[PDB]
DNA sequence: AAGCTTCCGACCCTTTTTTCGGACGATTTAAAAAACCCTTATAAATCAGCAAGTTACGAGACCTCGAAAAAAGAGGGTTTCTGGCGGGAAAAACTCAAAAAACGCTTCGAAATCAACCGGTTATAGGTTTTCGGAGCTA
């Protein structure tokens, strides 16, 4: 549950792409990217604003 | 003489190692404080077993919190067991057809027959014993 592989593939030239992830797919994102700080703190306050328009 | 390229010195900033100083701890030494000894006849403690009254220490219990262990829950993966669907081959119904084969007409005269009872025939249900086929096994 611990594993976290992801695997690139360099297709020459100007492009690459992420063949596969072994493991735990949540440590990426589709893109493979990995995020750069993690925090329990309550950023992103989605408490404040709702969505009655009218 | 000019442009390009390459060293070199000067400097700026931060990290890494060394040195020094300071502080704290430990030990040693010296000084100060508490204590010990020497004089006491008289006053108070020693103690004998048991009664009568009281409690300082032990045991029991419960709570409280924190942590540890276990159990559960989650997620990663692989192996296999089953079900559904699709596809090709064989079977058998379905469709098309002929050629027999039966039936009817239709037989007056020739068998067929049932009945009970005897002895005799023999197909074979059932059981008993046994080759053939396959088990794979092993390099």
Known sequence: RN???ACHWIR???HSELLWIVGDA???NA???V???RTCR???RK???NDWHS
Do not use: M
């Open 3 to 5: 594993t976290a592989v």
């Open 12 to 14: 020459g030239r100007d």
């Open 26 to 28: 949540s440590r990426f």
């Open 31 to 33: 893109q493979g990217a």
């Open 35 to 37: 995020p750069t700080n």
């Open 42 to 44: 309550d950023i992103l």
């Open 47 to 49: 408490e404040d604003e």
